[PDB]
Amino acid sequence: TYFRTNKFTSAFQEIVDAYGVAKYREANPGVFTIVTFPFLFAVMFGDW
Amino acid sequence: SSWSRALVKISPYTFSAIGIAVAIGVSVLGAAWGIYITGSSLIGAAIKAPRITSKNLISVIFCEAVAIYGVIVAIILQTKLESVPASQIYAPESLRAGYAIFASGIIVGFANLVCGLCVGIIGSSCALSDAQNSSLFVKILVIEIFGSALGLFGVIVGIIMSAQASWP
């Protein structure tokens, strides 16, 4: 099974799913990483 | 310190003579190697056909020109020698002259070796090319003549360095 993908969340979900899938309603780390990856990749390139 | 002092206290005349001899030796070795390289191809072509002996002889002459230049440089270096007086055996002029002689000899020998190797390879290729077709002999000979200029440039550099000898 696959969790429903929104118009904007689809890209992040696809990027995260490159590690695999889960059960019909199991854990979906994409929900946290949709903002976590922007919340961490910013530091490595911080320059306004 | 003590080892450094001993190293700085080496006789410059020995180094100068070593360089002078090494120039001629390296020139002779390079010329012989180039001559052998050209001669293998020349003999192969002659076995195939003896028609191009005159064309092939140019490569041998060019290879021997390196030995001739080396011999001339060695004669010049021998002329550059002096009496090596005991008082000035460690004088700055004597040390400078010995270092210049060694540098000139090394440069001449290395340049002669490189030019001989290049000329030998070029002639070995050119003999086979001429055996394949005599029409290409002119371009191959021109390329060999152009490549032979390395020895002339090295000899010029050595001659320029030879003016630095000032042994009392």
Partner: protein
């Protein structure tokens, strides 16, 4: 680089001149080429391997008997040298590179070398052993040519197996177990049971792509002719023969191809 002038230069020049001069008449030309090769006697091992190339087929032919005495009529020194039926096979196991391996691989003798198909299998195994031995002597640009030739032989054997020899137990496993990128990626031809499938398998190698083409010719023949004909067509690459490199094998192959062309000429 200086080793060429150190040794082998005269032999290389003689070989180059002989090749440049090259272009019962077929038999006479073959005899002349064989005499030229023999008169030429590091490079000794290369010459031995080149001779063993055809000597494997010569020994396979001599392994018969069954009108075995007729083998003396084709005693061409290029490939049918005397120096290169299990009792006689053990004696013939000497003085050949592939013979010691074939002694164990073809220990069944005529059982594994039946003249219908299994003799071709033994010949293919011997050719594979000889190709491996030749590839072992690495150090020159001829490794690519040897790999291409071995790949062509293996692919032709696989195509023949998939075409009709599959019924002769030449299955997908036998495409490499008995039928001699191929040394690493030959598994793609195990399922090429069709001409379209053969073209698709050839598509895995862009250089091999479009080589099969319609496959009406070349691939139409069995044994080792399918991809070997591709190598024959592409032999113009071998015609380059850059200098200061081992070109004795190239000259021998060119002479063999010229002899084959003269034979194919025949009565126009």
């Amino acid at each position: 680089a200086m080793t060429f002038n150190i040794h082998g230069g005269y032999l290389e020049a003689i070989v180059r001149g002989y090749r440049a001069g090259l272009l019962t008449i077929v038999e006479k030309c073959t005899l002349k080429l064989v005499d030229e090769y023999k008169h030429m006697l590091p490079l000794s091992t290369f010459l031995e391997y080149i001779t063993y190339g055809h000597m494997i087929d010569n020994v396979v032919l001599i392994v018969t008997g069954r009108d075995v005495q007729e083998l003396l009529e084709k005693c061409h020194p290029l490939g049918m040298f005397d120096s290169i039926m299990r009792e006689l096979y053990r004696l013939v196991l000497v003085d050949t590179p592939l013979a010691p391996y074939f002694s164990e691989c073809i220990t069944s003798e005529d059982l594994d070398d039946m003249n219908i198909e299994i003799m071709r299998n033994t010949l293919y195994k011997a050719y594979l052993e000889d190709f491996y031995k030749f590839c072992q002597k690495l150090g020159g640009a001829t490794a690519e040519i040897m790999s291409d030739l071995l790949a062509f032989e293996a692919d032709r054997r696989a195509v023949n197996i998939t075409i009709n020899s599959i019924g002769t137990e030449l299955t997908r496993d036998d495409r490499r177990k008995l039928y001699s990128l191929y040394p690493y990626g030959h598994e793609e031809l195990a399922v090429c049971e069709d001409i379209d499938q053969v073209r698709g398998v050839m598509e895995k190698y862009p250089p091999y792509q479009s080589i099969f083409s319609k496959l009406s010719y070349g691939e139409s023949q069995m044994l080792d002719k399918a991809f070997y004909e591709e190598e024959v067509k592409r032999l113009c690459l071998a015609f380059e023969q850059q200098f200061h490199y081992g070109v004795f094998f190239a000259y021998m192959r060119l002479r063999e191809q010229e002899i084959r062309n003269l034979m194919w000429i025949s009565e126009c």
